[PDB]
From a paper:
We therefore produced SeMet-substituted protein, which allowed us to determine the structure of CYRI-B by SAD phasing. Solved by X-ray crystallography at 2.4 Å resolution using the SAD method, the structure reveals three distinct, entirely α-helical, subdomains and high structural similarity to a conserved domain of CYFIP1. The native and SeMet-derivatized protein crystals have similar unit-cell dimensions and belong to the same ortho­rhombic space group, P212121. They were solved at resolutions of 2.37 and 2.40 Å, respectively. In both cases, a single molecule is present in the asymmetric unit. The two models are nearly identical and could be aligned with a Cα r.m.s.d. of 0.29 Å for 320 atoms. In both the native and the SeMet-derivatized structures, the flexible loop composed of residues 171–175 was too disordered to build and is therefore missing from the final models. This loop connects helices α7 and α8 of the medial subdomain. Biochemical analyses of R. typus CYRI-B were conducted to confirm the oligomeric state of the protein found by X-ray crystallography. As presented in Fig. 2(a), the native and SeMet-derivative proteins migrate as a single band on both native and SDS–PAGE gels. The gel electrophoresis and SEC results corroborate the crystallographic data, confirming the monomeric state of CYRI-B in solution.
Numbering used by the authors: 0 to 170, 176 to 324
Amino acid sequence: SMGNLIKVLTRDIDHNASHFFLDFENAQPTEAEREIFNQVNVVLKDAEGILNDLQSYRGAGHEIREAIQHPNDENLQEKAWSAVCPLVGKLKKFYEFSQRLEAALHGLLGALTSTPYSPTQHLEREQALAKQFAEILHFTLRFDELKMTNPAIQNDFSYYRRTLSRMRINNENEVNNELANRMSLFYAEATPMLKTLSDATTKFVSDNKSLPIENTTDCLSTMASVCRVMLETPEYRSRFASEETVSFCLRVMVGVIILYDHVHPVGAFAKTSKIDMKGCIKVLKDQPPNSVEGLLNALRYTTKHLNDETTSKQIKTMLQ
């Protein structure tokens, strides 16, 4: 049922572009999925506004550089402050939305990693939740791809913190030092949303001591192979691979690979791993470079076991 797993994960997304929530009537969640599907779909619904606010993040680099150049001109200091404050408000909204992804992820993992059923049976029984999990990873990579290309995010927040301290000594919606420290560590990450999801998955394995870790890791590796097989077999490429479906599974694949590398003890590159690392990197390399470079850079730096001595030198050359 490799073909069925592909149709389940890639259903109603060709006729659906740039939407992360699932239509309740179209997804058809079972009675056991209803309470989790509704809660996660509320987060996925708000995920569109988060991504559009990041696409519209213009930055305040122009006003900041003029204020730094003329530091005694209070009009330029107030103009830069008036431009950076609503941008910091967006950054505060992005970080708080990352906390909502952790709550929705626990509900999905708790249902997709039940004790008796296998990973393949879970993705077929809980189709609506399995589809929601892929949408969370789809938004996660798409958010981080934009953040990696926008250097004004860290520059605007760093200027905000420096100005706030030397403005709260000289002369409600403001950001306290405790929240600012967590936000600074959040945006210092290469993939902030993916690092957040990676820690939440490690938390889920830790919170369920009586649950075998394979129920979680083999769930990630199953989804990775579903996307890899469809993208590398022309018999499935001529049947499902569209620009919307390819870009969807490219980001789902890289997402579960990085989660698997942080959760599985030996990592995603070791000889006991279940991820076909060579096959996954090849799929990314066979794509136009401009639409994958953000995903490749995630594998070069965000990963945990890439630079290990156990990791094959063959894939290290692929990732160069």
